[PDB]
Amino acid sequence: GERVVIGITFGNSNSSIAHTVDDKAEVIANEDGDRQIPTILSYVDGDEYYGQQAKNFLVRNPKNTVAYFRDILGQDFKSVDPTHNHASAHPQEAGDNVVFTIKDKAEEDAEPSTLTVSEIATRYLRRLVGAASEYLGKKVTSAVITIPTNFTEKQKAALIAAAAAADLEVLQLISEPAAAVLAYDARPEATISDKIIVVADLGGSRSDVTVLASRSGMYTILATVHDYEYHGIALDKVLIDHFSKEFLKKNPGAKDPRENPRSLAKLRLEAESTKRALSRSTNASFSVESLIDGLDFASTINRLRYETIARTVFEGFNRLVESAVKKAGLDPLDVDEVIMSGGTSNTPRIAANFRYIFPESTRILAPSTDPSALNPSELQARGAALQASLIQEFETEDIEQSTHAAVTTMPHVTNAIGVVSVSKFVPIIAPETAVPARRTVHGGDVLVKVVEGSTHINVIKREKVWKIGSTLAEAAVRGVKKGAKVEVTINVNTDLTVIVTAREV
Amino acid sequence: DFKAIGKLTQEGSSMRTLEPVGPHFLAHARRVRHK
Ligand SMILES: Nc1ncnc2c1ncn2[C@@H]1O[C@H](COP(=O)(O)OP(=O)(O)OP(=O)(O)O)[C@@H](O)[C@H]1O
Numbered sequence A: 001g002e003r004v005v006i007g008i009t010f011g012n013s014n015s016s017i018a019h020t021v022d023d024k025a026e027v028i029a030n031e032d033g034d035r036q037i038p039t040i041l042s043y044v045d046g047d048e049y050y051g052q053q054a055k056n057f058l059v060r061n062p063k064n065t066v067a068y069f070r071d072i073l074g075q076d077f078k079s080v081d082p083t084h085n086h087a088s089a090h091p092q093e094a095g096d097n098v099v100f101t102i103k104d105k106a107e108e109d110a111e112p113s114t115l116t117v118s119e120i121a122t123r124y125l126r127r128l129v130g131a132a133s134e135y136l137g138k139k140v141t142s143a144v145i146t147i148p149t150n151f152t153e154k155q156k157a158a159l160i161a162a163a164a165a166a167d168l169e170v171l172q173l174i175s176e177p178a179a180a181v182l183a184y185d186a187r188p189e190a191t192i193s194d195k196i197i198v199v200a201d202l203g204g205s206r207s208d209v210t211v212l213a214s215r216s217g218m219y220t221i222l223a224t225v226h227d228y229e230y231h232g233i234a235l236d237k238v239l240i241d242h243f244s245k246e247f248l249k250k251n252p253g254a255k256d257p258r259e260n261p262r263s264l265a266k267l268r269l270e271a272e273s274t275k276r277a278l279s280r281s282t283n284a285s286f287s288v289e290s291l292i293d294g295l296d297f298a299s300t301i302n303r304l305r306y307e308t309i310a311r312t313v314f315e316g317f318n319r320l321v322e323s324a325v326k327k328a329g330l331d332p333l334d335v336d337e338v339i340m341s342g343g344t345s346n347t348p349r350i351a352a353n354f355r356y357i358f359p360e361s362t363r364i365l366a367p368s369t370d371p372s373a374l375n376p377s378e379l380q381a382r383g384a385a386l387q388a389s390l391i392q393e394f395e396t397e398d399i400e401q402s403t404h405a406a407v408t409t410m411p412h413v414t415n416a417i418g419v420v421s422v423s424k425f426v427p428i429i430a431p432e433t434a435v436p437a438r439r440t441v442h443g444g445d446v447l448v449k450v451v452e453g454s455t456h457i458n459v460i461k462r463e464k465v466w467k468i469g470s471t472l473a474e475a476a477v478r479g480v481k482k483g484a485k486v487e488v489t490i491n492v493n494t495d496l497t498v499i500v501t502a503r504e505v
Numbered sequence B: 001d002f003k004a005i006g007k008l009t010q011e012g013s014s015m016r017t018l019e020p021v022g023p024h025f026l027a028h029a030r031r032v033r034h035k
């Protein structure tokens, strides 16, 4: 009856599995040693390969290999962009459903199997959980799966169906940004508080920026921005082009290795592998064995040059964050933390650019800009692992009805409210806080005056200011004199009621 | 003690939606099911 639980992140490029240890969340590695497991499935001589092993067969076996299929579940055939599947097995239409033609049977004369994108997802998930099963020594019954914000319930149900078809119990579907925040706030070092967070999920085939409002340790999502143009694949191209131009100059007369599928497939793998080294080291090698015309290619590149050739894309990321913060009706001054997530967020330069974009107050969480930062790839799986860990005791009717009714109903105050202290305005309950909540902080009598507050920006350069709104209630306690501190607590209610209590020393 | 009851401006709160993750939501979800 009871369950084994994991957190499972499911991406177009990579997927991860993570379990819960009573103290802390642990990412599970597969039998290949990969914590970041490629979302790839391939068949050679009837044997199924997934993850890294399937990723390698994109060279000698492109047509029997399926990759970049997550954004294809529950998708109408025209809505998908088969740009990324051109290297591998191409998607095909089966009326409403998307299908792939691949030789998964051992016998040579056997016809290629036409498999639904759902069945593809089903076979991969089976292996994915199984790798966690082997590590844990126990069959895994349940998990929580991370999802993007903008995909429809058609995709969500499709994911649940394929997971059901993989005999895996999905507890809840949580969002990829919220998982990242949870992955930080649940740690002991973190201190829950009210602050506006922006999560920049830089991926392979996509990049998602999401702005949240963390109040009372609970997350409410203010704006979302998606972009399918600035991502790791673009960066991979920056390296592919850079190194391809170098190959022709050194080996005149040879075919351009981009013009041969097998040679280009080798370039893509190696360009990525060098890119990853450039995130850890200031110098990285790039090489391909018998790239084209039977010629080995060998070269190097230092980080500074890479940042130069990749400058164009990096600035694209900056405009994503600025657009998202703008989409929330905010300024970079309003941002407290930026949680860097996704595989491309290991790039050191991206963090450096974000530091310049934001004030010195704003926290930038990446291994290169904060001693407390976490591995950007692991965040979502940790988030999923934690969420899965907490839910495992509850039942499915509890999760389903609590999801829609309780999450929608709560309204949020549009203005901050605080006590005014002139001889200025101090916030007590930050704006956009969900009701109901409670907050309190610390030569004559003390006079507490509760007012509404908003944030404005004044060009004089710019800085955050508070304009005082309407007064709610006024209060004075008469005999404390010289004492230094004043504790004031105030409780907002579901009926928009405001309750101040006085007993400050 | 001195305690006053004030009313927020009717337009001070707009309807928004939350993220059903984390212990603080799940702990608050208990209060909503009860009422
Ligand atoms: N250490 C690293 N340095 C730089 N880039 C990296 C690093 N690790 C992974 N990447 C890149 O990040 C991308 C993968 O990120 P991630 O695994 O989060 O993507 P995904 O969510 O699986 O894919 P998508 O978001 O496109 O569906 C790939 O382009 C990969 O090359």
Ligand SMILES: [Mg+2]
Residues within 6 Å of the ligand: A011, A176, A201, A203, A342
């Ligand atoms: Mg992702």
